[PDB]
Ligand binder design. Structure first.
Ligand SMILES: Nc1nc2c(ncn2[C@@H]2O[C@H](COP(=O)(O)OP(=O)(O)OP(=O)(O)O)[C@@H](O)[C@H]2O)c(=O)[nH]1
Ligand SMILES: Nc1nc2c(ncn2[C@@H]2O[C@H](COP(=O)(O)OP(=O)(O)OP(=O)(O)O)[C@@H](O)[C@H]2O)c(=O)[nH]1
Ligand SMILES: COc1ccc(C=C2c3ccccc3C(=O)c3ccccc32)cc1O
Ligand SMILES: [Ca+2]
Ligand SMILES: [Mg+2]
Ligand SMILES: [Mg+2]
Lengths: 440, 67, 421
């Protein structure tokens, strides 16, 4: 059991979902029609990949997932896409009118018209679980649906499922690919509203991913397709412990114990390696020591910030592929005596390690080189608060003049919700500052 | 000791239910306040357009009363 | 889908309206019979936005043709793509407005408006999900100006949660010798600021200067001015009509272009009148603005730009970054990332590549100051004021429209002078 239900909200959530589930299928040897030859238990099973896939009597392996968007054109591409047979039609839910980059429309005006239907379809998935573990919610900060509807959903999920774990994969906005000027507003509102309802959230800075695609894969002008195929690798690394087995395999919940020292401090910094093109990877083997040291290069982070100017509260290394503890320990010992790694005084300095022997997979026609071993570092650093600081500043510039606020007020919201949301963020920045101060 | 054990798990249940309860009410309050506001905004808009019709009637009336 | 309902009122409205439908019908690859004869599927991806699909794959414009005189109606029906328009959507009176705003708004138009609304209602009720309306008209005349603003108020009554966009043609003595125009404009502006979500300020003063000084066309015809308007209207609706990163949504444009409800008057621009750096410098140049205003006499609140044709997207990003940096003083700092770029692979007709500009600049006040100046010159003498009171109007409604437009100017000035600190 230990099933996990994925919920993909808005364009970003959906399209990242397409990348993730395509990648999952290739890792598990599942076909586009849902058939899995290697799986001999037909109609069911308690294998590790069953945490993400249910099984029909006809041998089809179905993603434990719901796709939701208040506009049909993105999900329509799923309905007619390569993996259309993979999902039951009821798993793909669409309205007719999006949130127009407006949090209010996503949370209230438009969202309320579909929220009950969504919860019902989510319930149908959960009833098929023999031991539901929690939810994974994919969404953007900037979109009206990704922000507004997600926060509404998270609120409703806490009511219908109590304290059942809810994890986020959140797309932090970047001007190179941003779609709205009001994304800072939507970002602060969703973060405030969701904060009490999320147990752990992995932020993905689009600018960080944009730079990595340009720098490491030599893509002149990365598309969402370029970004999403990279994101899915990070997501895969994080969920690998749930979808596979192994002696040295460490469950994500165990890392979570270390990563969240206080409820509000639940935003881990992800760093992935190696990101390299086929051209450069040829006749070039990146060892355990090399990919591990790369985790402490800020240019490889999912969020733009400087951990070297902050303090660590946890450090987790999630390896996959040809990796053994001996080489890991050697690599860590070297890194500790050359890198700027400083912990807060209330936390032990030991790195927590997990290894999944299943090697990295790549999607056909992708840009990422197929390597024998990869690593994803999950750290809890005060430096992530820099991402809040940048967003909150852009929020302040516009709100001082009440720019664009009338679009929100027009949809039923009040300025009190803006000030309430911004104050919670200021408290959050203060929280990250306090945890870094030495004990008395 | 057995008594303490009961009190702990009861407290856990109480806090969990209290969280669910407050979350349920806080949300119902927000959607209600939002429904009121949005309606009040659309109602005012129509009232201003309603005044434009009343004005136009007074204009057309003012014309024939100058002949 | 997401349908837009087109409306064209008065002479000017129907002229540019007809031209708009000619140009995009070509781009979407449909003939004046309503049949598709294109090569790319991208032409029909978002065709439903402006067209109704009838029997036998017959694409009919979702357009409503209005005028208080039947003259222009025959011109459209006889002109190219006159056989594509829906016959029942032709709504015509018999008595013109005679360039009288009061007639169009209170008297003559108020009698014809209901039959128009019946056609609006019939079109709207057949939409999967109506997103709003777009109006083409002038503010200098009587019908398109007076009755156009009447329709807006009436449509907004039955569709208050829909977007109301307008392509308003501003009057200029350089083109029209009619004397009472600054009255009809001020009275129209008084309505547009209250009841429209997005207004594209098409300025004849600008259109004239472009044909004359840039295109080297002394004594420019309306066909010349409209060729500019058509290319402009085609550009600012490209993303509404073609597949892209961001889809066709009037509301999303309004949300990101309008920081304050009253300040929704855009000055469009077009280029050329090449390489990517050239296009970018031109489209931001004052000479290429369809509104007679210098952007360097104010600051940009927001800007939307559409490049069309096959070109380097890396280069477009770099050059757009370059302009914002080199001209940072002309963009308000209290709105981060207020310039957004879109790219359509399909170029217009005749050009290998072009660039359309949509700016929300505080420099637009120059246009409203021009009208206000010409207005107060007429109103101090009460010249031709009897043509308006004759229909039952009051001197106050002239005063209110004046001061309301004066407020709009000062409000644009307020946010031009505003600072981050
Ligand atoms: N990484 C990544 N980011 C995306 C993708 N699609 C959209 N985004 C980001 O999401 C933000 C806008 O939110 P969207 O998800 O597109 O909008 P939405 O959730 O559908 O809500 P609506 O406004 O109603 O459309 C922008 O900052 C985009 O950069 C994607 O496929 N991958
Ligand atoms: N750019 C452009 N402007 C036009 C065109 N036709 C008329 N105008 C302008 O429109 C203004 C007058 O409004 P019209 O549209 O002609 O008049 P109307 O809307 O039919 O109202 P009435 O004639 O009084 O019934 C003048 O200032 C003209 O310069 C045109 O084809 N192109
Ligand atoms: C100023 O900020 C913005 C302004 C406008 C938009 C959206 C749009 C827009 C949105 C929906 C439909 C059409 C358009 C466009 O045709 C357009 C063309 C180029 C760039 C942006 C835009 C998005 C923004 O973030
Ligand atoms: Ca099985
Ligand atoms: Mg969307
Ligand atoms: Mg005329």
């Amino acid at each position: 059991m230990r099933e996990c239900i994925s919920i993909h909200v808005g364009q970003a959530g959906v399209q990242i979902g397409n990348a993730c589930w395509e990648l999952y299928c290739l890792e598990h040897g599942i076909q586009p029609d849902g058939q899995m030859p290697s799986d001999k238990t037909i109609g069911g099973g308690d294998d590790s990949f069953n945490t993400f896939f249910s099984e029909t009597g006809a041998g089809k392996h179905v993603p434990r997932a719901v796709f939701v968007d208040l506009e049909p054109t993105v999900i329509d591409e799923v309905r007619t896409g390569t993996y259309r047979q993979l999902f039951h039609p009821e798993q793909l839910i669409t309205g007719k009118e999006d949130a127009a980059n407006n949090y209010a429309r996503g949370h209230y005006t438009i969202g309320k018209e579909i929220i009950d239907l969504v919860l019902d379809r989510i319930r149908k998935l959960a009833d098929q679980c023999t031991g539901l573990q929690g939810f994974l919610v994919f969404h953007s900060f900037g979109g009206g649906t990704g922000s507004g509807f997600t926060s509404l959903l998270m609120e409703r999920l806490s009511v219908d499922y109590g304290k059942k774990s809810k994890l986020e994969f959140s797309i932090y906005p970047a001007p190179q690919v941003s779609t709205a000027v009001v994304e800072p507003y939507n970002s602060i509102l969703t973060t405030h509203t969701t904060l009490e309802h999320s147990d752990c959230a992995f932020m993905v800075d689009n600018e960080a991913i944009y730079d990595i695609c340009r720098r490491n894969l030599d893509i002149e002008r990365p598309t969402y397709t370029n970004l999403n195929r990279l994101i899915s690798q990070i997501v895969s690394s994080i969920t690998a412990s749930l979808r596979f087995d192994g002696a040295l395999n460490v469950d994500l919940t165990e890392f979570q114990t270390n990563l969240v020292p206080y409820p509000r401090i639940h935003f881990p910094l992800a760093t992935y390696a190696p990101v390299i093109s086929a051209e450069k990877a040829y006749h070039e083997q990146l060892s355990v020591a090399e990919i591990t040291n790369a985790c402490f290069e800020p240019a490889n982070q999912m969020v733009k910030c400087d951990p070297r100017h902050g303090k660590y509260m946890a450090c987790c290394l999630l390896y996959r592929g040809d990796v053994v503890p001996k080489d890991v320990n050697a690599a860590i010992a070297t890194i500790k005596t050359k890198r700027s790694i400083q912990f807060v005084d209330w936390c032990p300095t030991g790195f927590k390690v997990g290894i999944n022997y299943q090697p990295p997979t790549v999607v056909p026609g992708g840009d990422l080189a197929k390597v024998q071993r990869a690593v994803c570092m999950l750290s809890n650093t005060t430096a992530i608060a820099e991402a809040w600081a940048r967003l909150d500043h852009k929020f302040d510039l516009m709100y001082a003049k009440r720019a664009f606020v009338h679009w929100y007020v027009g949809e039923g919201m009040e300025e009190g919700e803006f000030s309430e949301a911004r104050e919670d963020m200021a408290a959050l920045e203060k929280d990250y500052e306090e945890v870094g101060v030495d004990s008395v | 000791k057995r008594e303490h054990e009961r009190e702990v798990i009861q407290k856990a249940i109480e806090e969990n239910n209290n969280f669910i309860k407050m979350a349920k009410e806080k949300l119902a309050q927000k959607m209600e306040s939002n429904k009121e506001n949005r309606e009040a905004h659309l109602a005012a808009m129509l009232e201003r357009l309603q005044e434009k019709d009343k004005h136009a009637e007074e204009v057309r009336k003012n014309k024939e009363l100058k002949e | 889908m997401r349908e837009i309902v087109h409306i064209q009122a008065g002479q000017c409205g129907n002229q540019i309206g007809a031209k708009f439908w000619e140009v995009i019908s070509d781009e979407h690859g449909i003939d004046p019979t309503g049949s598709y004869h294109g090569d790319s599927d991208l032409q029909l991806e978002r065709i439903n936005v402006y067209y109704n699909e009838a029997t036998g794959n017959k694409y009919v414009p979702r357009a409503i043709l209005v005028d208080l005189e039947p003259g222009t109606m025959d011109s459209v029906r006889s002109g190219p793509f006159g056989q594509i328009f829906r016959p029942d959507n032709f709504v015509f009176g018999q008595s013109g407005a005679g360039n009288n705003w009061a007639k169009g708004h209170y008297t003559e138009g108020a009698e014809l408006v209901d039959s128009v609304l019946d056609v609006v209602r019939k079109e709207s009720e057949s939409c999967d999900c109506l997103q709003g309306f777009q109006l083409t008209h002038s503010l200098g005349g009587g019908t398109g100006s007076g009755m156009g603003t009447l329709l807006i108020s009436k449509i907004r009554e039955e569709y208050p949660d829909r977007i109301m966009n307008t392509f308003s043609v501003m009057p200029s003595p350089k083109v029209s010798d009619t004397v009472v125009e600054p009255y009809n404009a001020t009275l129209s502006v008084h309505q547009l600021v209250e009841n429209t979500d997005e207004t594209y300020c098409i300025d004849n003063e600008a259109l004239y200067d472009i044909c004359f000084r840039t295109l080297k066309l002394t004594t420019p015809t309306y066909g010349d001015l409209n060729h500019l308007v058509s290319a402009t209207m085609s550009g600012v609706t490209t993303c509404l009509r073609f597949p892209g990163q961001l889809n066709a949504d009037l509301r999303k444009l309004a949300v990101n272009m309008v920081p304050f409800p009253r300040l929704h008057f855009f000055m469009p621009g077009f280029a050329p009148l090449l390489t990517v750096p050239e296009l970018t410098q031109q489209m931001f140049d004052s000479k290429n603005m369809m509104a007679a205003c210098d952007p360097r006499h104010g600051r940009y609140l927001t800007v939307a730009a559409i490049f069309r044709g096959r070109m380097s997207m890396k280069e477009v990003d770099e050059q757009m970054l370059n302009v914002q940096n080199k001209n940072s003083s002309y963009f308000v700092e209290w709105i981060p990332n207020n310039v957004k770029t879109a790219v359509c692979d399909i170029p217009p007709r005749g050009l290998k590549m072009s660039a359309t500009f949509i700016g929300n600049s505080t420099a637009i006040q120059e246009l409203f100051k021009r009208i206000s100046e010409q207005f107060t010159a007429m109103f101090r003498r009460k010249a031709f004021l009897h043509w308006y009171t004759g229909e039952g109007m009051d001197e106050m409604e002239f005063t209110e429209a004046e001061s309301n437009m004066n407020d709009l100017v000062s409000e644009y000035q307020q946010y031009q002078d505003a600072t981050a600190d």
